[PDB]
Amino acid sequence: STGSATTTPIDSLDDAYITPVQIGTPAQTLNLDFDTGSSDLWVFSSETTASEVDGQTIYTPSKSTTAKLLSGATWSISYGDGSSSSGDVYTDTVSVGGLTVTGQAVESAKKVSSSFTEDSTIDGLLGLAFSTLNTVSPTQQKTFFDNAKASLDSPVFTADLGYHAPGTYNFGFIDTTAYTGSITYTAVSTKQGFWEWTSTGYAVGSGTFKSTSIDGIADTGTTLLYLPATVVSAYWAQVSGAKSSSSVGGYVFPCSATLPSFTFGVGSARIVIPGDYIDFGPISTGSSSCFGGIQSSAGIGINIFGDVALKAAFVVFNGATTPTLGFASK
């Protein structure tokens, strides 16, 4: 089997991406944030504290003839950005782009943190990291991809995120028309539960490429590109007036700037992030200070190849017995 679903930016700045997912019988379609950095499929629901719901579409398990309460199971997750959610668990039928998993754990939120409530565009998350990170207790549950894997034509999914435009998540096949040149594959460590790999270096604009190992994760659920302070300083030094602002919470730059590109290495291959991809707009409405899309990972504890980086590539998440990652230009 295969599946193919369109993923769409939530706003004009690509602050996150949503993909429609069918849950239950009859189908209830929710717009979920596909997140290769976590491993829980959780949704706003009829059980979510009413004051914490503001415009999201909810899953109502009582209206699904295939929903079953997973007795005794609870979940609770805290994300790197400080957000969180928790609740109980159903199993139900979940379909993405034509690919159906029966008996999928659907984690129903009883509580969500403020950033989730405040984002009316996202009805939940669909985790695509390794199932070892799944938070369901006392019996850990598998991701949608893990459950689908045996049925898929090939044990892979691909992320093809757009810049200020829709893109595609495919399951079970590689669309050879969706990228240019060749896909370069690179090793993955699953030791931390992530799609963790090592970039071979970087360049800023038309500058020379610096060969240096940068360990990080391919994370579709993180918006920005988080890299070591040395790398990030080298990038923003090429933008007149750019500075790190403690009060704003990262590098900002004059909105009048034309940003340089940023290149990262995948083995001997190179992925070029155009400068415009690094512009996240005014820090507040009407400001002429703009927020940068490349930020320091210092104090995160990990480098994160988030959407800023991934959207410049066609990315293969190869879930074979020894997983690997592939990157192509597009």
mmCIF file of C-alpha atoms in Angstrom:
data_model
loop_
_atom_site.group_PDB
_atom_site.id
_atom_site.type_symbol
_atom_site.label_atom_id
_atom_site.label_comp_id
_atom_site.label_asym_id
_atom_site.label_seq_id
_atom_site.Cartn_x
_atom_site.Cartn_y
_atom_site.Cartn_z
ATOM 1 C CA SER A 1 0.000 0.000 0.000
ATOM 2 C CA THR A 2 0.906 3.681 -0.225
ATOM 3 C CA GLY A 3 -0.474 7.024 0.890
ATOM 4 C CA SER A 4 -0.038 10.593 -0.322
ATOM 5 C CA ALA A 5 -1.322 13.726 1.442
ATOM 6 C CA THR A 6 -0.817 17.414 0.851
ATOM 7 C CA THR A 7 0.732 19.428 3.678
ATOM 8 C CA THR A 8 -0.058 23.147 3.877
ATOM 9 C CA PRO A 9 1.564 26.036 5.759
ATOM 10 C CA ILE A 10 -0.642 27.309 8.594
ATOM 11 C CA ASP A 11 0.086 30.957 7.815
ATOM 12 C CA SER A 12 1.996 33.261 5.445
ATOM 13 C CA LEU A 13 5.299 32.661 7.243
ATOM 14 C CA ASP A 14 5.290 28.829 7.212
ATOM 15 C CA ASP A 15 5.187 28.833 11.017
ATOM 16 C CA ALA A 16 4.108 25.154 10.856
ATOM 17 C CA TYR A 17 2.458 22.738 8.402
ATOM 18 C CA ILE A 18 -0.859 20.886 8.612
ATOM 19 C CA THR A 19 -1.923 17.670 6.904
ATOM 20 C CA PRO A 20 -5.490 16.304 6.907
ATOM 21 C CA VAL A 21 -5.970 12.977 8.686
ATOM 22 C CA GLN A 22 -9.105 10.845 8.783
ATOM 23 C CA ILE A 23 -9.918 9.349 12.200
ATOM 24 C CA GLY A 24 -12.762 7.021 13.032
ATOM 25 C CA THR A 25 -15.905 5.721 11.378
ATOM 26 C CA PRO A 26 -17.454 7.687 9.818
ATOM 27 C CA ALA A 27 -14.306 9.664 9.196
ATOM 28 C CA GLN A 28 -13.566 12.730 11.301
ATOM 29 C CA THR A 29 -10.979 14.821 9.469
ATOM 30 C CA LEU A 30 -8.504 16.733 11.646
ATOM 31 C CA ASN A 31 -5.569 18.848 10.487
ATOM 32 C CA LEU A 32 -2.492 17.501 12.219
ATOM 33 C CA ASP A 33 1.098 18.693 12.532
ATOM 34 C CA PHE A 34 3.257 15.842 11.232
ATOM 35 C CA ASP A 35 6.244 15.801 13.570
ATOM 36 C CA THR A 36 9.328 13.667 12.857
ATOM 37 C CA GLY A 37 10.664 14.862 16.233
ATOM 38 C CA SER A 38 8.054 13.115 18.416
ATOM 39 C CA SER A 39 6.153 9.840 18.540
ATOM 40 C CA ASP A 40 2.621 10.500 19.807
ATOM 41 C CA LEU A 41 -0.498 10.935 17.662
ATOM 42 C CA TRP A 42 -2.650 13.191 19.833
ATOM 43 C CA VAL A 43 -5.723 15.245 19.073
ATOM 44 C CA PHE A 44 -7.965 17.931 20.444
ATOM 45 C CA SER A 45 -11.096 16.078 21.456
ATOM 46 C CA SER A 46 -14.514 16.149 23.082
ATOM 47 C CA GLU A 47 -12.588 15.416 26.305
ATOM 48 C CA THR A 48 -10.372 18.509 26.098
ATOM 49 C CA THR A 49 -10.962 21.088 28.843
ATOM 50 C CA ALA A 50 -13.418 23.495 27.205
ATOM 51 C CA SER A 51 -11.506 26.674 28.090
ATOM 52 C CA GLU A 52 -8.458 25.224 26.318
ATOM 53 C CA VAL A 53 -10.227 24.782 22.979
ATOM 54 C CA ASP A 54 -10.398 27.838 20.696
ATOM 55 C CA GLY A 55 -11.433 27.015 17.138
ATOM 56 C CA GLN A 56 -9.731 23.651 16.697
ATOM 57 C CA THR A 57 -11.599 20.750 15.176
ATOM 58 C CA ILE A 58 -12.130 18.007 17.755
ATOM 59 C CA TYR A 59 -12.202 14.223 17.645
ATOM 60 C CA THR A 60 -15.305 12.810 19.333
ATOM 61 C CA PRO A 61 -14.687 9.119 19.993
ATOM 62 C CA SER A 62 -18.288 8.450 21.028
ATOM 63 C CA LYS A 63 -19.308 9.215 17.431
ATOM 64 C CA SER A 64 -16.878 6.685 15.971
ATOM 65 C CA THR A 65 -18.150 3.122 15.715
ATOM 66 C CA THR A 66 -14.574 1.825 15.551
ATOM 67 C CA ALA A 67 -13.206 3.746 18.577
ATOM 68 C CA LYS A 68 -12.279 1.690 21.610
ATOM 69 C CA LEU A 69 -11.014 3.069 24.909
ATOM 70 C CA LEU A 70 -7.547 1.668 25.623
ATOM 71 C CA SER A 71 -8.206 0.706 29.207
ATOM 72 C CA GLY A 72 -5.972 2.316 31.792
ATOM 73 C CA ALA A 73 -3.783 4.086 29.264
ATOM 74 C CA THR A 74 -2.706 7.695 29.699
ATOM 75 C CA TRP A 75 -0.188 9.955 27.996
ATOM 76 C CA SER A 76 1.650 13.170 28.786
ATOM 77 C CA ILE A 77 4.166 14.953 26.601
ATOM 78 C CA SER A 78 6.388 18.000 26.970
ATOM 79 C CA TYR A 79 7.988 19.438 23.836
ATOM 80 C CA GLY A 80 11.347 21.171 23.487
ATOM 81 C CA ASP A 81 9.670 24.546 23.051
ATOM 82 C CA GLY A 82 7.966 24.330 26.443
ATOM 83 C CA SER A 83 4.513 23.299 25.225
ATOM 84 C CA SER A 84 2.669 20.230 26.567
ATOM 85 C CA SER A 85 -0.500 18.138 26.476
ATOM 86 C CA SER A 86 -1.916 15.027 28.157
ATOM 87 C CA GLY A 87 -4.943 12.753 28.281
ATOM 88 C CA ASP A 88 -6.255 9.238 27.683
ATOM 89 C CA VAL A 89 -6.109 6.863 24.727
ATOM 90 C CA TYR A 90 -8.391 5.252 22.187
ATOM 91 C CA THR A 91 -7.608 2.912 19.360
ATOM 92 C CA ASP A 92 -9.325 3.737 16.082
ATOM 93 C CA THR A 93 -8.934 3.648 12.311
ATOM 94 C CA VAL A 94 -6.609 6.350 10.995
ATOM 95 C CA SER A 95 -6.048 7.154 7.327
ATOM 96 C CA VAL A 96 -3.531 9.535 5.732
ATOM 97 C CA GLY A 97 -3.735 10.212 2.039
ATOM 98 C CA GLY A 98 -5.416 6.903 1.285
ATOM 99 C CA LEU A 99 -3.265 4.739 3.594
ATOM 100 C CA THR A 100 -5.259 3.147 6.421
ATOM 101 C CA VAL A 101 -4.108 1.796 9.774
ATOM 102 C CA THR A 102 -6.596 -0.033 11.950
ATOM 103 C CA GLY A 103 -6.066 -0.123 15.705
ATOM 104 C CA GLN A 104 -3.962 3.054 15.764
ATOM 105 C CA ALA A 105 -3.459 4.644 19.184
ATOM 106 C CA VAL A 106 -5.215 8.025 19.083
ATOM 107 C CA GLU A 107 -4.274 9.991 22.152
ATOM 108 C CA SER A 108 -7.171 12.167 23.238
ATOM 109 C CA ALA A 109 -6.199 15.413 24.974
ATOM 110 C CA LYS A 110 -7.779 16.260 28.299
ATOM 111 C CA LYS A 111 -5.344 19.168 28.787
ATOM 112 C CA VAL A 112 -3.260 21.254 26.391
ATOM 113 C CA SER A 113 -0.897 24.151 27.109
ATOM 114 C CA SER A 114 -1.565 27.710 26.061
ATOM 115 C CA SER A 115 0.417 27.668 22.815
ATOM 116 C CA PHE A 116 -1.768 24.840 21.512
ATOM 117 C CA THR A 117 -5.003 26.586 22.517
ATOM 118 C CA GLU A 118 -3.795 29.807 20.904
ATOM 119 C CA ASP A 119 -3.079 28.108 17.559
ATOM 120 C CA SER A 120 -6.516 27.450 16.042
ATOM 121 C CA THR A 121 -4.993 25.922 12.893
ATOM 122 C CA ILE A 122 -3.549 22.778 14.484
ATOM 123 C CA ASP A 123 -5.893 20.047 15.715
ATOM 124 C CA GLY A 124 -3.122 17.832 17.106
ATOM 125 C CA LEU A 125 0.202 16.213 16.228
ATOM 126 C CA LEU A 126 1.081 13.036 14.338
ATOM 127 C CA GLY A 127 4.449 11.793 15.544
ATOM 128 C CA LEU A 128 6.871 10.212 13.078
ATOM 129 C CA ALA A 129 9.989 9.742 15.217
ATOM 130 C CA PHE A 130 10.786 6.289 16.612
ATOM 131 C CA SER A 131 8.178 4.554 18.751
ATOM 132 C CA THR A 132 10.624 4.299 21.671
ATOM 133 C CA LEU A 133 9.711 7.963 22.417
ATOM 134 C CA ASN A 134 5.945 7.323 22.606
ATOM 135 C CA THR A 135 4.605 8.522 25.984
ATOM 136 C CA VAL A 136 1.637 6.198 26.483
ATOM 137 C CA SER A 137 1.709 4.459 29.863
ATOM 138 C CA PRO A 138 1.720 1.723 31.023
ATOM 139 C CA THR A 139 1.885 0.190 27.542
ATOM 140 C CA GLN A 140 3.867 2.204 24.999
ATOM 141 C CA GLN A 141 2.150 2.536 21.619
ATOM 142 C CA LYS A 142 3.431 2.542 18.043
ATOM 143 C CA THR A 143 3.478 5.458 15.618
ATOM 144 C CA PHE A 144 1.297 5.560 12.537
ATOM 145 C CA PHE A 145 4.363 4.851 10.391
ATOM 146 C CA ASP A 146 5.448 1.915 12.578
ATOM 147 C CA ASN A 147 1.963 0.406 12.306
ATOM 148 C CA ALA A 148 1.763 0.984 8.537
ATOM 149 C CA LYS A 149 5.264 -0.225 7.780
ATOM 150 C CA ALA A 150 4.654 -3.895 7.070
ATOM 151 C CA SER A 151 1.867 -3.077 4.618
ATOM 152 C CA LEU A 152 3.730 -0.344 2.778
ATOM 153 C CA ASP A 153 5.258 -1.152 -0.587
ATOM 154 C CA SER A 154 8.573 0.134 0.814
ATOM 155 C CA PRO A 155 9.187 0.989 4.501
ATOM 156 C CA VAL A 156 9.663 4.716 3.902
ATOM 157 C CA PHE A 157 7.977 8.058 4.079
ATOM 158 C CA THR A 158 9.013 11.308 2.423
ATOM 159 C CA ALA A 159 8.658 14.949 3.371
ATOM 160 C CA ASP A 160 8.428 17.549 0.623
ATOM 161 C CA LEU A 161 7.599 20.792 2.399
ATOM 162 C CA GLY A 162 6.880 23.939 0.415
ATOM 163 C CA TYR A 163 8.160 27.458 0.869
ATOM 164 C CA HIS A 164 5.077 29.648 1.218
ATOM 165 C CA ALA A 165 3.245 26.873 -0.714
ATOM 166 C CA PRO A 166 1.730 23.421 -0.182
ATOM 167 C CA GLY A 167 3.824 20.274 -0.323
ATOM 168 C CA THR A 168 3.498 16.534 0.189
ATOM 169 C CA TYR A 169 3.958 13.682 2.635
ATOM 170 C CA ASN A 170 4.174 10.297 0.900
ATOM 171 C CA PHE A 171 4.137 6.896 2.566
ATOM 172 C CA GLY A 172 5.451 3.720 1.014
ATOM 173 C CA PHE A 173 7.095 5.073 -2.150
ATOM 174 C CA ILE A 174 9.605 7.575 -3.474
ATOM 175 C CA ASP A 175 8.194 9.952 -6.088
ATOM 176 C CA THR A 176 11.100 10.201 -8.538
ATOM 177 C CA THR A 177 9.469 13.213 -10.217
ATOM 178 C CA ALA A 178 9.555 15.295 -7.030
ATOM 179 C CA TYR A 179 13.252 16.109 -6.873
ATOM 180 C CA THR A 180 16.205 16.992 -9.075
ATOM 181 C CA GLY A 181 19.465 15.081 -9.382
ATOM 182 C CA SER A 182 20.029 12.182 -7.006
ATOM 183 C CA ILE A 183 19.075 11.434 -3.414
ATOM 184 C CA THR A 184 22.097 11.268 -1.110
ATOM 185 C CA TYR A 185 21.606 8.890 1.802
ATOM 186 C CA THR A 186 23.287 9.317 5.154
ATOM 187 C CA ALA A 187 23.478 7.302 8.389
ATOM 188 C CA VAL A 188 20.970 7.620 11.204
ATOM 189 C CA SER A 189 21.369 7.015 14.915
ATOM 190 C CA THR A 190 18.154 6.004 16.652
ATOM 191 C CA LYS A 191 19.771 6.024 20.107
ATOM 192 C CA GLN A 192 17.815 9.108 21.220
ATOM 193 C CA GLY A 193 14.642 8.102 19.359
ATOM 194 C CA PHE A 194 15.122 10.734 16.649
ATOM 195 C CA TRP A 195 16.057 10.801 12.971
ATOM 196 C CA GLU A 196 19.545 11.859 14.065
ATOM 197 C CA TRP A 197 22.283 12.280 11.476
ATOM 198 C CA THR A 198 25.523 14.173 10.885
ATOM 199 C CA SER A 199 25.798 16.986 8.377
ATOM 200 C CA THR A 200 29.198 17.359 6.741
ATOM 201 C CA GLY A 201 29.363 21.152 6.964
ATOM 202 C CA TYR A 202 28.011 24.467 5.777
ATOM 203 C CA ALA A 203 28.466 27.613 3.736
ATOM 204 C CA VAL A 204 27.054 31.113 4.034
ATOM 205 C CA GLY A 205 25.924 32.720 0.797
ATOM 206 C CA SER A 206 28.587 32.378 -1.892
ATOM 207 C CA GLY A 207 31.254 31.716 0.743
ATOM 208 C CA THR A 208 33.545 28.720 0.932
ATOM 209 C CA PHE A 209 32.189 25.489 2.358
ATOM 210 C CA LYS A 210 33.390 24.636 5.864
ATOM 211 C CA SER A 211 33.847 20.906 6.389
ATOM 212 C CA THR A 212 32.721 20.142 9.917
ATOM 213 C CA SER A 213 30.537 17.485 11.492
ATOM 214 C CA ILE A 214 27.199 18.772 12.762
ATOM 215 C CA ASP A 215 25.094 16.153 14.544
ATOM 216 C CA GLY A 216 21.403 17.008 14.555
ATOM 217 C CA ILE A 217 17.888 15.799 13.976
ATOM 218 C CA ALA A 218 15.583 16.000 10.966
ATOM 219 C CA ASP A 219 12.504 17.475 12.646
ATOM 220 C CA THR A 220 9.461 18.494 10.631
ATOM 221 C CA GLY A 221 7.768 19.620 13.857
ATOM 222 C CA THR A 222 10.312 22.355 14.521
ATOM 223 C CA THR A 223 9.872 25.484 12.415
ATOM 224 C CA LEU A 224 13.389 26.916 12.424
ATOM 225 C CA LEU A 225 16.974 25.746 11.880
ATOM 226 C CA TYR A 226 18.926 25.484 15.160
ATOM 227 C CA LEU A 227 22.691 25.133 14.830
ATOM 228 C CA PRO A 228 25.805 25.715 16.946
ATOM 229 C CA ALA A 229 26.475 29.297 17.983
ATOM 230 C CA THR A 230 29.648 29.469 15.904
ATOM 231 C CA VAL A 231 27.763 28.564 12.730
ATOM 232 C CA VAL A 232 24.864 30.903 13.453
ATOM 233 C CA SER A 233 27.197 33.816 14.224
ATOM 234 C CA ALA A 234 28.981 33.249 10.931
ATOM 235 C CA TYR A 235 25.645 33.413 9.097
ATOM 236 C CA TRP A 236 24.260 36.578 10.738
ATOM 237 C CA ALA A 237 27.614 38.370 10.454
ATOM 238 C CA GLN A 238 26.807 38.578 6.731
ATOM 239 C CA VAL A 239 23.635 40.579 7.365
ATOM 240 C CA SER A 240 24.127 44.278 8.124
ATOM 241 C CA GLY A 241 22.485 45.199 11.396
ATOM 242 C CA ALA A 242 21.644 41.643 12.475
ATOM 243 C CA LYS A 243 22.065 40.946 16.181
ATOM 244 C CA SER A 244 21.136 38.496 18.874
ATOM 245 C CA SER A 245 18.449 39.954 21.085
ATOM 246 C CA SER A 246 17.941 38.460 24.537
ATOM 247 C CA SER A 247 14.644 40.348 24.900
ATOM 248 C CA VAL A 248 13.257 39.026 21.612
ATOM 249 C CA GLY A 249 14.748 35.548 22.084
ATOM 250 C CA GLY A 250 17.156 35.156 19.189
ATOM 251 C CA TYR A 251 18.733 36.743 16.154
ATOM 252 C CA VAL A 252 16.795 39.553 14.555
ATOM 253 C CA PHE A 253 17.649 41.558 11.478
ATOM 254 C CA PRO A 254 16.445 44.640 9.625
ATOM 255 C CA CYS A 255 13.391 43.751 7.583
ATOM 256 C CA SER A 256 14.945 45.816 4.757
ATOM 257 C CA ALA A 257 17.746 43.231 4.371
ATOM 258 C CA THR A 258 18.226 40.769 1.552
ATOM 259 C CA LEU A 259 19.330 37.572 3.300
ATOM 260 C CA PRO A 260 22.139 35.331 2.051
ATOM 261 C CA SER A 261 21.514 31.640 1.409
ATOM 262 C CA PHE A 262 22.725 28.932 3.747
ATOM 263 C CA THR A 263 24.116 25.634 2.497
ATOM 264 C CA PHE A 264 24.369 22.411 4.498
ATOM 265 C CA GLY A 265 26.217 19.247 3.570
ATOM 266 C CA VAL A 266 24.759 15.770 3.245
ATOM 267 C CA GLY A 267 27.769 13.579 2.582
ATOM 268 C CA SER A 268 29.394 15.070 -0.524
ATOM 269 C CA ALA A 269 26.072 16.678 -1.553
ATOM 270 C CA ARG A 270 24.877 20.176 -0.771
ATOM 271 C CA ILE A 271 21.422 21.539 0.035
ATOM 272 C CA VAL A 272 20.963 25.273 -0.483
ATOM 273 C CA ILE A 273 18.452 27.158 1.648
ATOM 274 C CA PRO A 274 17.581 30.395 -0.209
ATOM 275 C CA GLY A 275 17.858 33.547 1.876
ATOM 276 C CA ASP A 276 14.134 34.269 1.715
ATOM 277 C CA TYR A 277 13.450 31.005 3.568
ATOM 278 C CA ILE A 278 15.284 32.481 6.577
ATOM 279 C CA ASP A 279 12.921 35.487 6.955
ATOM 280 C CA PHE A 280 10.217 35.006 9.619
ATOM 281 C CA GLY A 281 8.868 38.515 9.424
ATOM 282 C CA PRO A 282 8.346 41.358 11.879
ATOM 283 C CA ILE A 283 8.932 40.523 15.537
ATOM 284 C CA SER A 284 5.636 42.283 16.293
ATOM 285 C CA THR A 285 3.062 43.824 13.970
ATOM 286 C CA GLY A 286 4.445 46.952 12.315
ATOM 287 C CA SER A 287 8.021 46.437 13.485
ATOM 288 C CA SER A 288 10.955 46.848 11.100
ATOM 289 C CA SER A 289 12.907 44.234 13.038
ATOM 290 C CA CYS A 290 12.460 40.742 11.594
ATOM 291 C CA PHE A 291 12.962 37.349 13.222
ATOM 292 C CA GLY A 292 15.651 35.079 11.831
ATOM 293 C CA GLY A 293 15.044 31.529 10.674
ATOM 294 C CA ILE A 294 18.503 30.324 11.711
ATOM 295 C CA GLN A 295 19.013 30.389 15.469
ATOM 296 C CA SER A 296 21.482 29.065 18.005
ATOM 297 C CA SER A 297 21.000 25.591 19.458
ATOM 298 C CA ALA A 298 23.029 26.577 22.516
ATOM 299 C CA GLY A 299 21.023 25.500 25.534
ATOM 300 C CA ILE A 300 18.745 23.251 23.471
ATOM 301 C CA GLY A 301 21.179 20.395 23.861
ATOM 302 C CA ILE A 302 20.724 19.291 20.252
ATOM 303 C CA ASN A 303 20.973 20.747 16.755
ATOM 304 C CA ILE A 304 17.684 20.743 14.872
ATOM 305 C CA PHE A 305 17.223 20.642 11.113
ATOM 306 C CA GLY A 306 13.693 22.002 11.233
ATOM 307 C CA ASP A 307 11.400 23.176 8.472
ATOM 308 C CA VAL A 308 13.690 25.994 7.319
ATOM 309 C CA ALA A 309 16.238 23.346 6.300
ATOM 310 C CA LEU A 310 13.933 20.502 5.323
ATOM 311 C CA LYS A 311 11.742 22.595 3.020
ATOM 312 C CA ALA A 312 14.816 23.218 0.802
ATOM 313 C CA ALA A 313 14.982 19.452 0.128
ATOM 314 C CA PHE A 314 13.090 16.324 -0.757
ATOM 315 C CA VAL A 315 13.673 14.201 2.340
ATOM 316 C CA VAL A 316 13.460 10.414 2.620
ATOM 317 C CA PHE A 317 12.859 8.880 6.021
ATOM 318 C CA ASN A 318 13.942 5.314 5.346
ATOM 319 C CA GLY A 319 12.542 3.021 8.017
ATOM 320 C CA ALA A 320 14.296 -0.167 6.930
ATOM 321 C CA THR A 321 15.850 -2.402 9.597
ATOM 322 C CA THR A 322 18.792 -0.001 9.677
ATOM 323 C CA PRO A 323 17.178 3.392 9.126
ATOM 324 C CA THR A 324 18.776 6.062 6.946
ATOM 325 C CA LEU A 325 17.905 9.573 5.726
ATOM 326 C CA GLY A 326 18.003 10.755 2.134
ATOM 327 C CA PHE A 327 18.199 14.332 0.864
ATOM 328 C CA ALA A 328 17.771 15.650 -2.681
ATOM 329 C CA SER A 329 17.544 19.142 -4.088
ATOM 330 C CA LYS A 330 14.242 20.008 -5.740
#
